[PDB]
Amino acid sequence: SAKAPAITIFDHRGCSRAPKESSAKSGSQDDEMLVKVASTKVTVSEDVAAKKLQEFIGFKEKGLDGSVIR
Amino acid sequence: GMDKSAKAPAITIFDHRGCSRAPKESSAKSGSQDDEMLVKVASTKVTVSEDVAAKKLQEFIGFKEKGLDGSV
Amino acid sequence: LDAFSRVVTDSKAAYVGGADLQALKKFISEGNKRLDAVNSIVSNASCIVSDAVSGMICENPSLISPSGNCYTNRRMAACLRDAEIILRYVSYALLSGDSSVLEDRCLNGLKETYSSLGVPANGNARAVSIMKACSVAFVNNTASQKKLSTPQGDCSGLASEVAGYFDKVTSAIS
Amino acid sequence: FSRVVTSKAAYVGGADLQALKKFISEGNKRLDAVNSIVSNASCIVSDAVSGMICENPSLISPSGNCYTNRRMAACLRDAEIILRYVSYALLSGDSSVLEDRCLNGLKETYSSLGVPANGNARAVSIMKACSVAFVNNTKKLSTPQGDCSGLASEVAGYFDKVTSAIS
Ligand SMILES: *C(=C)C1=C(C)C(=O)N/C1=C\c1[nH]c(/C=C2\N=C(C[C@H]3NC(=O)C(C=C)=C3C)C(C)=C2CCC(=O)O)c(CCC(=O)O)c1C
Ligand SMILES: *C(=C)C1=C(C)C(=O)N/C1=C\c1[nH]c(/C=C2\N=C(C[C@H]3NC(=O)C(C=C)=C3C)C(C)=C2CCC(=O)O)c(CCC(=O)O)c1C
Ligand SMILES: *C(=C)C1=C(C)[C@@H](Cc2[nH]c(/C=C3N=C(/C=C4\NC(=O)[C@H](C)[C@H]4[C@@H](*)C)C(C)=C\3CCC(=O)O)c(CCC(=O)O)c2C)NC1=O
Ligand SMILES: *C(=C)C1=C(C)[C@@H](Cc2[nH]c(/C=C3N=C(/C=C4\NC(=O)[C@H](C)[C@H]4[C@@H](*)C)C(C)=C\3CCC(=O)O)c(CCC(=O)O)c2C)NC1=O
Ligand SMILES: *[C@@H](C)[C@H]1/C(=C/C2=NC(=C\c3[nH]c(C[C@H]4NC(=O)C(C=C)=C4C)c(C)c3CCC(=O)O)/C(CCC(=O)O)=C2C)NC(=O)[C@@H]1C
Ligand SMILES: *[C@@H](C)[C@H]1/C(=C/C2=NC(=C\c3[nH]c(C[C@H]4NC(=O)C(C=C)=C4C)c(C)c3CCC(=O)O)/C(CCC(=O)O)=C2C)NC(=O)[C@@H]1C
Ligand SMILES: *[C@H](C)[C@H]1/C(=C/C2=NC(=C\c3[nH]c(C[C@H]4NC(=O)C(C=C)=C4C)c(C)c3CCC(=O)O)/C(CCC(=O)O)=C2C)NC(=O)[C@@H]1C
Ligand SMILES: *[C@H](C)[C@H]1/C(=C/C2=NC(=C\c3[nH]c(C[C@H]4NC(=O)C(C=C)=C4C)c(C)c3CCC(=O)O)/C(CCC(=O)O)=C2C)NC(=O)[C@@H]1C
């Protein structure tokens, strides 16, 4: 079904945006942080895959990290 | 002038020396290893899918993490 | 976790903050460290998936040759999708602190599915291995404090734990 | 390369590529430098936009110019457009196309739309820092080791034209 856990981690300590997704207060800095866990379909549009192909087809270049094994 | 078309040059560099897939896109032999390398350039409309931007908002909205590179 | 049970099995999400978050961190090993580790993998998910599929391909270009399994946008997108799925389930295993959901909802029947489709085992092994190496580096991140998003300490235990989860993937699908 | 920027792709290999590299400064290194930027373009664009946003979270608040997918996509698109015109300026060894087809008239456009100058400044600065690090690369290297600092300062300057043009 191509679903997978989509986790979001908000360490928003000191953020002026008032929390309102839980409101179950705790009296500590845990009141400005949140783990959001959902399950959502994983999708890759053929347009995005065309963009990544164009980035891969050189076969030579890479990011800073990792050894060369091309 | 910037013509609001969103078109930009899309460049692909192929250093494909020794590649078993034969060159066939350029049409001027030089008898050097240049025959196995190519620069491709097109003028394409740049578009970012609202799906991508949506998936990108989920990575960004944490406001904390990053890649290895970069100051905080 | 039963609040996380119904999640990783509808459309509605789940939100853990406040007092519940305080107690969740008391029930899982190294709660604060573990959240940092999860956040750094999932916030870099796109580069991890992209870099692993790209590296799988630069090592074996025939994968995007006309006969390769990543040839055409449809196949490439599905390969990118699978890499992301795998990484997401591994990221949930690190959040939960166990591989129950990973094995039951992601790895089960996966090797027989890839066999029937002719998805090549060696490319998949390289793809996951790279994602493993990316994830370990992000958990063990050894950068400056002005460039580290977390308080500096020792996370080799969590890195070892996530590496174990990736090993479960490679052992199951090859 | 000028028929492109003004709809068929140009393919430059063989003798045409051999002559191109005799007509530009450091032809082989220049194409490696372009390769290392363009092959990393997605990560550069998204890291620069993400970095602009983590420095200023209100850009994705309801009042910010990246709020909604329509705007975020437009912003990611623009950063890629900018990055690609810079990569083309490095390919061709000058900034004439960059100034004419990309920057000429852009600042007035951003003013009318309300696209914030300061955020754009940071985004461009991050893309510059990225591109300089890939040209200077800052085992594990795809090219022969040597000195590409000249090309790095050249591409740094094309970003600086963007920075001057839209601030
Ligand atoms: C601080 C950082 C921020 C500044 C400064 C700013 O201008 N905006 C900031 C944050 C911001 N938050 C959101 C949206 C969400 N944030 C959360 C997480 C929190 N909810 C909570 O209950 C707690 C505490 C327990 C949190 C921490 C959630 C759930 C959302 C909604 C969307 C989601 O990702 O689920 C935004 C985006 C726009 C908005 O809704 O304000 C911004 C910019
Ligand atoms: C070697 C690397 C390869 C192995 C081994 C393999 O299995 N496939 C390899 C390469 C490969 N190339 C393409 C497609 C293109 N290659 C070029 C570049 C070259 N063509 C030339 O004429 C010259 C020099 C004069 C080159 C250098 C181009 C332009 C394309 C078309 C695609 C594009 O992005 O424009 C592929 C993709 C499948 C195919 O067409 O064979 C692969 C896998
Ligand atoms: C093809 C030419 C080709 C590649 C593509 C590349 C693939 C490859 N990548 C690694 C290792 C890592 N990749 C990482 C990814 C990232 N680092 C960052 O800073 C960003 C956010 C992110 C996306 C680009 C990381 C963190 C690592 C681990 C660090 C390291 O240097 O190892 C490898 C090595 C994997 C392994 O060791 O098994 C490979 C092969 N290489 C190519 O040749
Ligand atoms: C918000 C929390 C936040 C960010 C997001 C991040 C943005 C940022 N990034 C840099 C510097 C670089 N980013 C690079 C990008 C990449 N490197 C890779 O290996 C991959 C393929 C790619 C995508 C992640 C690079 C190469 C650099 C420069 C190299 C280096 O720094 O050694 C900066 C620094 C900008 C500057 O110096 O002005 C910033 C701000 N940082 C955040 O805080
Ligand atoms: C390994 C992953 C890391 C590393 C992590 C450490 N984090 C430490 C403390 C710490 N981290 C957080 C953030 C965390 N808690 C949350 O609730 C959420 C979001 C929901 C997150 C992201 C907190 C709050 C704390 C506690 C102290 C503080 O307030 O800053 C930590 C300290 C030791 C320890 O807590 O055992 C470490 C080592 N350190 C590393 O070097 C790698 C990269
Ligand atoms: C800075 C960009 C780099 C770096 C690069 C160097 N490249 C050097 C030589 C070189 N590069 C190529 C490939 C190039 N020419 C092409 O036609 C194409 C594709 C169309 C590409 C990608 C070639 C062919 C050569 C010449 C040598 C060879 O035959 O392999 C090089 C050597 C110095 C010089 O030639 O002046 C360097 C230093 N090196 C670095 O350390 C940074 C990161
Ligand atoms: C991201 C770093 C920015 C940001 C960018 C936004 N730009 C928006 C619209 C827009 N951008 C252009 C310039 C673009 N079109 C081109 O043809 C070229 C080069 C040839 C470029 C650079 C135009 C013309 C437009 C308007 C028309 C259109 O969208 O196609 C935009 C949308 C505004 C809106 O409609 O609300 C955004 C958000 N926003 C940011 O916050 C950072 C700084
Ligand atoms: C990329 C790293 C691979 C590669 C992957 C491909 N997978 C293809 C199809 C496919 N993958 C799955 C498993 C996926 N779906 C799930 O629900 C879960 C876990 C919850 C996972 C991991 C399925 C079920 C399928 C078939 C149905 C479908 O497409 O959704 C695929 C397409 C094959 C084809 O079009 O014939 C590819 C290319 N291919 C590679 O070469 C590397 C190693």
Automatic annotation (TrEMBL), chain A:
Binding, 15,16-dihydrobiliverdin: C15, R17, K20, E21, S22, K36
Membrane topology: Peripheral membrane protein
One GO cellular component term: chloroplast thylakoid membrane
Domain of life: Eukaryota
Compartments it resides in: Plastid, Chloroplast thylakoid membrane
Binding site for (2R,3E)-phycoerythrobilin 2: R13, Q29
Positions of (2R,3E)-phycoerythrobilin 3 binding: D65, G66, S67, I69, R70
Positions bound to (2R,3E)-phycoerythrobilin 1: A2
Keywords: Bile pigment, Chloroplast, Chromophore, Electron transport, Membrane, Photosynthesis, Plastid, Signal, Thylakoid, Transport
Keyword Signal: yes
Protein's GO biological process: photosynthesis
Residue ranges of domain Phycoerythrin alpha chain in the record: 3-58
Protein purpose: Light-harvesting photosynthetic tetrapyrrole chromophore-protein from the phycobiliprotein complex.
Family indicated by similarity: Belongs to the phycoerythrin family.
Protein name: Phycoerythrin alpha-subunit 1
Naturally occurring in which organism (per UniProt): Proteomonas sulcata
Source organism phylogeny: Eukaryota, Cryptophyceae, Pyrenomonadales, Geminigeraceae, Proteomonas
Name of the gene this protein is made from: cpeA1
Whole-protein residues included: 54 to 123 of 125
